[PDB]
Design an enzyme around this catalytic site. Structure first.
Site, PDB file in Angstrom:
ATOM      1  N   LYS A  17       0.909  -1.332   0.183  1.00 58.54           N
ATOM      2  CA  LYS A  17       0.074   0.277  -0.123  1.00 58.54           C
ATOM      3  C   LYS A  17       0.997   1.461   0.160  1.00 58.54           C
ATOM      4  CE  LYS A  17      -3.833  -1.166   0.427  1.00 58.54           C
ATOM      5  NZ  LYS A  17      -4.173  -2.758  -1.598  1.00 58.54           N
ATOM      6  N   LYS A  69      15.890  -5.614   2.628  1.00 55.36           N
ATOM      7  CA  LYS A  69      16.118  -4.344   3.387  1.00 55.36           C
ATOM      8  C   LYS A  69      18.123  -4.643   3.976  1.00 55.36           C
ATOM      9  CE  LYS A  69      11.582  -3.301   5.083  1.00 55.36           C
ATOM     10  NZ  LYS A  69      10.804  -4.467   6.895  1.00 55.36           N
ATOM     11  N   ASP A 105      11.634   2.290   9.396  1.00 53.66           N
ATOM     12  CA  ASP A 105      10.325   0.757  10.467  1.00 53.66           C
ATOM     13  C   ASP A 105      11.317   0.958  12.083  1.00 53.66           C
ATOM     14  OD1 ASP A 105      10.824  -0.636   8.605  1.00 53.66           O
ATOM     15  OD2 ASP A 105      11.559  -1.620   8.111  1.00 53.66           O
ATOM     16  N   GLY A 122      11.668 -13.854  13.857  1.00 51.23           N
ATOM     17  CA  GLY A 122      12.549 -13.394  12.079  1.00 51.23           C
ATOM     18  C   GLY A 122      13.473 -13.227  12.488  1.00 51.23           C
ATOM     19  N   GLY A 124      15.116 -11.272   9.729  1.00 53.37           N
ATOM     20  CA  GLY A 124      15.330 -10.369   8.101  1.00 53.37           C
ATOM     21  C   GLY A 124      15.434  -8.801   9.154  1.00 53.37           C
ATOM     22  N   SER A 126      13.394  -6.260   8.727  1.00 53.19           N
ATOM     23  CA  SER A 126      11.868  -5.894   9.914  1.00 53.19           C
ATOM     24  C   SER A 126      12.229  -6.246  11.615  1.00 53.19           C
ATOM     25  CB  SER A 126      10.951  -6.309   9.512  1.00 53.19           C
ATOM     26  OG  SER A 126      10.504  -5.650   8.519  1.00 53.19           O
ATOM     27  N   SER A 178       8.104 -14.214   7.712  1.00 56.04           N
ATOM     28  CA  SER A 178       7.524 -13.638   6.509  1.00 56.04           C
ATOM     29  C   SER A 178       6.003 -14.726   6.457  1.00 56.04           C
ATOM     30  CB  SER A 178       8.489 -14.324   5.362  1.00 56.04           C
ATOM     31  OG  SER A 178       8.764 -15.759   5.042  1.00 56.04           O
ATOM     32  N   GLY A 225      -0.693  -4.623  11.437  1.00 55.95           N
ATOM     33  CA  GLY A 225       0.509  -3.850  10.985  1.00 55.95           C
ATOM     34  C   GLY A 225       0.391  -2.318  10.104  1.00 55.95           C
ATOM     35  N   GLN A 232       5.660   4.565   9.599  1.00 57.45           N
ATOM     36  CA  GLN A 232       7.069   4.550   9.139  1.00 57.45           C
ATOM     37  C   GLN A 232       6.888   5.089   7.530  1.00 57.45           C
ATOM     38  OE1 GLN A 232       5.770   1.701   5.776  1.00 57.45           O
ATOM     39  NE2 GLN A 232       8.860   2.273   5.449  1.00 57.45           N
TER      40      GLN A 232
END
Length: 258
Positions: A17, A69, A105, A122, A124, A126, A178, A225, A232
């Site tokens: 979005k 990222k 973030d 996680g 990654g 984020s 993810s 989120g 962000q």
């Protein structure tokens, strides 16, 4: 108007979005900016190079999402702000012909919160930014993953790192994997039930995922989120505006359009 191009690099990216909310700001603030920004999604092949593509497209700025990222942090010419400690970049700006990386973030997540410790799932970009931000705010942070990936980064922050789920109560349980993208849980259902029963908030970065649905089922407070996306993005727009439009103003426009 003078035009400047922007976009978001991700794979996948069609669900983002970010174009909607950034274009709404570029339209709204064009008089103050004295240029018209236009923002597009960019499905980046896994084999491509973020910097080369940014230059090739003639972008003035961009966002970066999964799985890029950490790569973006590596390929920037300069890293500024809290990104220095995040090992991840989600915001790129061409400044004086250099590709500069930022991370919104970390603060976007903070601002999204209405907690003494947290479990992050996680490894990654984020997860790395969130761990950096939560350690900085004085929470105890545990991180749980399936392999020793990202382990050095989190250990240097001072996080407790696990591959087997720790038998401990956490105020915040954060899904930064993810799994939700793929419509699955990030952990064994009974393990998650254990955490949710003792948790204050189940938080998923996706914007109803299996993780949030399970929290709902158990009557555990939950949050998706959406607020993080808006903060962000607003903080990124501040950067795209050369810090002329404050994030608060962008937030208003973006929240309304979203």
């Amino acid at each position: 108007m003078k035009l400047k191009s922007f976009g978001v690099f991700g794979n996948p990216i069609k669900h983002s979005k970010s174009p909607l909310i950034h274009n709404a700001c570029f339209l709204t603030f064009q008089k103050e900016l004295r240029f018209l920004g236009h923002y597009h999604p960019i499905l980046l092949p896994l084999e491509s190079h973020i910097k080369s593509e940014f230059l090739h497209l003639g972008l003035s700025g961009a966002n970066v999402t999964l799985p890029f990222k950490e790569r973006a942090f590596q390929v920037c010419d300069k890293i500024k702000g809290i990104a220095l400690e995040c090992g991840a970049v989600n915001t790129l700006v061409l400044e004086n012909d250099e590709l500069v990386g930022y991370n919104t973030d970390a603060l976007g997540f903070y601002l999204s919160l209405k907690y003494q410790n947290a479990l992050i799932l996680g490894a990654g970009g984020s997860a790395k930014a969130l761990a950096c931000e939560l350690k900085k705010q004085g929470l105890q942070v545990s991180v749980l993953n399936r392999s020793s990936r990202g382990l050095d980064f989190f250990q240097r922050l001072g996080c407790d790192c696990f591959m087997e789920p720790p038998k401990s109560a956490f105020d915040l349980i954060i899904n930064a994997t993810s799994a939700s993208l793929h419509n699955e849980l990030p952990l064994n259902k009974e393990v998650l039930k254990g955490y949710f029963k003792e948790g204050k908030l189940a938080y998923d970065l996706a914007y109803l995922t299996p993780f949030l649905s399970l929290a709902k089922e158990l009557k555990t407070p939950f949050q998706d989120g959406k607020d993080m996306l808006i903060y962000q993005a607003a903080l990124s727009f501040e950067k795209f505006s050369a810090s002329q439009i404050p994030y608060s103003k962008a937030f208003e426009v973006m929240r309304s359009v979203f």
